[PDB]
Design a protein around this ligand. Structure first.
Ligand code: CHL
Ligand code: CLA
Ligand code: CLA
Ligand code: CLA
Ligand code: CLA
Ligand code: CLA
Ligand code: CLA
Ligand code: CLA
Ligand SMILES: CC(/C=C/C=C(C)/C=C/[C@@]12O[C@]1(C)C[C@@H](O)CC2(C)C)=C\C=C\C=C(C)\C=C\C=C(C)\C=C\[C@@]12O[C@]1(C)C[C@@H](O)CC2(C)C
Ligand SMILES: CC1=C(/C=C/C(C)=C/C=C/C(C)=C/C=C/C=C(C)/C=C/C=C(C)/C=C/C2=C(C)CCCC2(C)C)C(C)(C)CCC1
Ligand SMILES: CCCCCCCS[C@@H]1O[C@H](CO)[C@@H](O)[C@H](O)[C@H]1O
Lengths: 199, 98, 40, 197, 153
């Protein structure tokens, strides 16, 4: 389909790619190589954003804290972490920083020795143990579903960040419950119009 | 209370491991494309005899070509990190954010 | 008559008439609305 | 095709084919055809909104003066208490209009893009003229004759002038339109714009 | 208030300035008969000063530690009458002038010797053009979309 009904689609976007709805007003993907890089970047971003949403929502829904509150055990000299209400014996900032740096630097490396363009985004193999990708038609439709769900997760991350900035000290689940309490008074309106009656 | 020898040795070891097994390929493929040159030719080819590269110094019997210059660079990075850790842990700085 | 109207359309004469009218307008505005620092 | 000023020739681009053409363009705003096509749509939508606005300010005040209903003034209805608070209402209005006005704009850019609805692809708007959708927007099937368009444009222009009069009268008197009319008709020769200055 | 300034209705230096101005004006009043025309003219100046200071008090201006009004430009919604509204009015008048000039320069461009209409002005043509600046924002915008504003060389 098309993102803007009644608008001609750009020449460099012909709809053959998964989830291609002809959205590129600024013309960032005119160069084919840049478009190919952007595709893999978008899929990699979508997967991280999709992983983030349950990890932001579930701990707060269980009362374990808040996606912003959970990061403030650091910035305290004696700070120790907590998992499901249980202290982490090694959960101190200098240790976790080194472990995170080493592990992520090692796994992001050797993601880069993959030179086949199609397998930079869809490696398969050990990452596809159940074999969903063997059927080509199903593989293509699953690609479309992955990109479409990822875009929604990306938008939800911005929702989380802007809600946190707009209402400090609150969480996404708290915001949803507050809206569901009085939907006609707890909205975005008192934030874009910040309680300032001009007359 | 932090042992200086342990911290320095561990940081140097980690830096050398990263430089030898993780970031080696990127560094080599980047130095391959950046050779200083003036007017389309290298400094030595221009006539600067003091700009000749030391072939007898950069060669090594490492299976991937790790040499003394890589050791010096990654060890300097490891020592810098180690001394940052020691100097940042000894002080009692508390950013009172919360 | 035509030539005199052509002369009165020359740049200096039109300029002095226009700036005289402007000066009179501004002077009368300042006479009836003096000492204006802001716009109420 | 009439003359807004008897004697003045009509501009060349005003051919007398458009509804409501009286040769009125002293400032040459519609000389470029691309600008005239835009100004036709602008006039239609502004007249249509001003019509409803003038009705909304006038009629409930007339019915309040007669005692049938009791509603606040048009300039005072804003700070009344409703079920949804002003900011929420504004946000809903912004979203709904951001949809409908872009749908309308796509038709101005090219005539026949947005005739088909997305959700129920079975239906579609029959081909029409810009600013005159019809079909669903004309449920009672009133025929769009030249007379009807001329009446619509005349009443719309009168409505825009009425809206401007309402705004200036409230700014310079502080009261509503109908009470200004009552005060004037009570003693016409001492209740004019001169006595308010 | 803003930037440590106090409103001129509260500041004592403003009132002291007003008192000293009236005292300076009243010293020359002693040299004339109470009924003479110079005595009538200095009294008008005294009333003008009183009205000026009362207006500066009423408009809600901010005064420094010197008793003089200070302008606030940053964009405060209670100080728009000092820069924002006058600036908008100036930008409306200047755009009017510029647009009327541009239209007249365009109208005489296609003639045999167009330099003669630049020293001897075609007054009827100028009269035609002049009142088109009342809607100058609309036309200036509209030639931006179409592309009749900027010469693409
Ligand atoms: C047609 C557009 C339109 C007009 C002419 C007005 C007219 C007015 N509204 Mg208003 N509104 C309009 C759109 C809307 N209003 C509101 C909701 C309100 C509220 C809550 C209030 C007003 C108020 C006002 C008045 C004060 C305006 C002012 O001085 O503020 C200056 C503002 C600008 C210069 C901008 C004025 C008569 C005030 C009022 O009612 O005063 C007694 C008031 O409290 N309006 C919404 C949201 C539902 C609109 C969206 O459509
Ligand atoms: C992008 C992925 C991501 C990241 C970076 C985090 C990061 C974090 N999660 Mg988390 N989480 C995620 C996805 C993620 N989560 C998902 C997908 C789920 C759903 C299953 C959860 C469910 C979850 C719970 C239920 C809790 C956390 C908690 C935490 C925090 C403590 C980590 C810890 O001590 O674990 C240590 C883990 C190990 C040492 C693993 C080895 C065994 C940390 C900020 C805790 C928290 O918020 O504490 C305040 C907590 O209780 N997470
Ligand atoms: C860029 C420099 C500049 C600026 C911003 C000003 C600004 C001002 N001067 Mg000033 N002045 C300047 C240079 C400047 N002057 C110079 C160089 C001199 C020396 C000749 C003077 C001499 C001077 C005197 C002697 C006086 C001013 C006054 C004023 C104020 C006039 C208010 C007024 O009449 O509003 C009313 C005018 C309008 C609203 C304009 C209307 C224009 C048209 C008609 C509108 C209609 C169509 C819509 C205003 C703050 C007067 C004042 O009261 O100061 C406090 C005053 O008495 N100035
Ligand atoms: C939003 C208001 C609006 C708009 C867009 C138009 C647009 C149009 N009118 Mg129109 N008209 C209006 C209000 C408007 N009118 C009102 C209120 C009246 C009653 C006085 C008329 C009476 C009228 C007549 C009698 C005629 C037109 C005609 C036209 C068409 C050619 C003239 C032109 O280019 O105008 C461009 C207009 C604008 C760009 C709007 C400028 C508005 C500025 C802000 C002025 C400020 C108004 C106020 C002083 C404050 C054009 C489609 C002529 C035609 O052929 O119609 C088919 C014609 O004969 N109009
Ligand atoms: C004097 C008022 C008036 C008149 C004569 C017209 C005339 C026309 N409109 Mg129209 N319109 C108006 C006001 C008016 N409009 C307003 C205010 C709006 C905004 C809501 C619209 C929105 C509108 C749309 C969206 C469409 C039309 C269409 C039409 C055409 C066919 C419908 C018809 O014959 O209407 C006859 C009109 C009347 C008999 C007026 C009845 C008076 C009512 C009942 C007053 C109600 C009381 C009020 C609440 C107070 C015709 C040219 C359609 C068209 O062109 O089809 C191709 C079309 O699609 N108009
Ligand atoms: C739409 C037409 C219209 C009508 C019927 C009225 C009617 C009235 N106006 Mg009014 N007015 C209008 C437009 C209109 N106005 C516009 C557009 C403005 C903005 C400039 C004003 C600004 C205005 C002020 C500032 C004041 C009035 C006042 C009044 C009332 C008595 C004094 C008077 O009429 O002289 C003044 C009338 C005018 C200045 C209007 C001239 C401009 C319009 C466009 C004339 C058009 C004539 C039109 C063809 C007639 C249509 C008749 C039709 C309805 C049958 C009277 C009820 C006075 C009032 O409320 O005191 C009781 C008052 O103080 N009006
Ligand atoms: C130097 C850069 C700069 C710029 C470009 C602006 C620009 C602006 N400021 Mg601003 N401001 C500045 C510095 C600046 N400010 C500083 C340093 C302060 C501290 C005193 C303020 C304090 C300030 C206030 C308190 C307000 C503004 C407001 C505004 C807006 C004017 C209202 C408007 O046009 O509605 C669009 C405008 C966007 C007003 C506003 O509504 O902003 C949204 C307003 O109320 N400003
Ligand atoms: C049609 C009139 C007109 C227009 C539209 C412009 C427009 C422009 N001039 Mg400009 N200019 C003009 C006349 C005009 N000028 C005259 C007569 C002179 C000689 C004194 C200059 C000297 C001049 C210089 C030295 C510079 C500009 C610059 C500019 C540009 C930036 C704005 C600016 O700095 O304004 C400032 C404008 C002036 C200082 C001169 C204004 C003179 C009056 C107000 C204009 C009167 C026009 C005419 C007499 C009225 C026509 C009447 C007709 C209906 C019969 C802008 C494109 C600047 C530029 O290129 O940067 C982008 C720049 O550095 N102009
Ligand atoms: C749309 C409109 C008004 C809409 C009003 C609305 C929705 C009101 C809503 C409310 O009241 C209610 C319902 C209930 C209240 O509780 C709340 C509010 C919100 C207050 C006015 C348009 C008003 C539009 C107007 C007045 C336009 C006038 C334009 C003119 C006269 C131009 C003339 C020229 O352009 C030509 C024709 C030819 C050129 O050559 C020469 C010149 C002269 C330049
Ligand atoms: C042979 C061999 C081996 C071994 C190796 C080794 C063991 C090496 C080592 C190496 C090393 C061991 C190196 C080191 C280096 C170091 C360095 C290079 C350092 C530097 C330093 C610095 C640079 C410092 C600085 C400073 C100062 C001076 C002062 C204080 C502060 C600071 C820190 C800044 C193996 C078994 C593996 C295998 C094969 C065989
Ligand atoms: C107030 C608007 C009308 C003012 C008319 C004044 C004279 S108009 C005058 O006529 C001359 C020929 O007689 C022309 O040469 C000249 O260009 C023209 O400006």
């Amino acid at each position: 389909a098309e993102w803007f009904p009644g608008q001609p689609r750009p020449d460099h976007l012909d709809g053959s790619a998964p989830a291609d709805f002809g959205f590129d007003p600024l013309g960032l993907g005119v160069e084919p190589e840049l478009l190919e890089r952007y595709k893999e970047s978008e899929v990699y971003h979508c997967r991280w954003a999709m992983l983030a949403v349950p990890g932001i929502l579930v701990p707060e829904a269980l009362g374990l804290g808040n996606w912003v509150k959970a990061q403030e055990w650091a910035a305290i000299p004696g700070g120790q972490a907590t998992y499901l209400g249980n202290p982490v014996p090694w959960g101190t900032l200098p240790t976790i920083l080194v472990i995170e740096f080493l592990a992520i630097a090692f796994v992001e490396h050797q993601r880069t020795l993959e030179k086949d363009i199609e397998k930079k985004k869809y490696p398969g193999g050990a990452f596809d143990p159940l074999g969903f990708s063997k059927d080509p038609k199903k593989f293509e439709e699953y690609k479309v579903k992955e990109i479409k769900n990822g875009r929604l997760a990306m938008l939800a991350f911005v929702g989380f960040c802007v809600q946190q900035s707009a209402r400090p000290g609150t969480g996404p689940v708290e915001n949803l419950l507050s809206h569901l309490a009085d939907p006609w008074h707890n909205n975005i309106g008192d934030i874009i119009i910040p309680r300032n009656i001009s007359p | 209370e932090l042992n200086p020898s342990l911290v320095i040795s561990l940081s140097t070891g980690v830096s050398l491991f990263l430089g030898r097994f993780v970031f080696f390929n990127f560094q080599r493929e980047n130095v391959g494309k950046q050779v200083p040159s003036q007017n389309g030719i290298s400094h030595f080819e221009a006539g600067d005899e003091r700009a000749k590269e030391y072939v007898s110094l950069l060669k090594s019997n490492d299976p991937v070509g790790f040499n003394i210059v890589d050791v010096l660079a990654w060890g300097s990075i490891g020592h810098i990190v180690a001394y940052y850790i020691l100097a940042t842990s000894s002080n009692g700085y508390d950013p009172n954010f919360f | 008559m035509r030539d005199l109207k052509t002369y009165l359309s020359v740049a200096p004469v039109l300029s002095t008439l226009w700036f005289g009218a402007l000066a009179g307008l501004l002077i009368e505005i300042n006479r009836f609305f003096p000492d204006a620092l802001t716009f109420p | 095709k009439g003359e807004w000023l008897p004697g003045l020739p009509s501009p060349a681009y005003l051919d007398g084919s458009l509804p409501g053409d009286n040769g009125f363009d002293p400032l040459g705003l519609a000389e470029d055809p691309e600008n005239l096509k835009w100004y036709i749509q602008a006039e239609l939508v502004n007249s249509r909104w001003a019509m409803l606005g003038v009705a909304g300010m006038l009629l409930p005040e007339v019915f309040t003066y007669l005692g049938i209903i009791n509603v606040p003034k048009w300039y005072d209805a804003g700070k009344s208490e409703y079920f949804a608070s002003s900011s929420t209402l504004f946000v809903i209005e912004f979203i709904l209009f951001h949809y409908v006005e872009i749908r309308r704009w796509q038709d101005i850019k090219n005539p026949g893009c947005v005739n088909q609805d997305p959700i129920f692809k079975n239906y579609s708007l029959p081909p029409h003229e810009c600013g005159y959708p019809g079909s669903v927007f004309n449920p009672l099937n009133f025929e769009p004759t030249l007379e009807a368009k001329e009446k619509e444009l005349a009443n719309g222009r009168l409505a825009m002038l009425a809206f401007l009069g309402f705004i200036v009268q409230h700014n310079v008197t502080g009261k509503g339109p109908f009470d200004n009319l009552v005060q004037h008709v009570a003693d016409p020769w001492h209740n004019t714009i001169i006595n308010t200055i | 208030d803003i930037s440590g300034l106090t409103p001129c209705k509260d500041s004592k230096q403003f009132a002291k300035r007003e008192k000293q101005q009236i005292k300076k004006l009243e010293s020359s009043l002693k040299l004339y008969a109470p009924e003479s025309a110079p005595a009538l003219a200095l009294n008008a100046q005294i009333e003008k000063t009183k009205r000026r200071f009362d207006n500066y008090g009423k408009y809600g201006l901010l005064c420094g530690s010197d008793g003089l009004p200070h302008l606030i430009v940053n964009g405060d919604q209670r100080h728009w009458g000092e820069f924002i509204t006058p600036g908008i009015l100036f930008l409306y008048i200047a755009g009017w002038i510029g647009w009327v000039g541009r239209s007249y320069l365009i109208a005489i461009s296609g003639e045999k010797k167009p330099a003669m209409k630049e020293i001897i002005i075609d007054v009827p043509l100028a009269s035609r053009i002049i009142f088109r600046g009342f809607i100058w924002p609309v036309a200036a915008y509209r030639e931006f979309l179409n592309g009749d504003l900027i010469a693409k060389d």
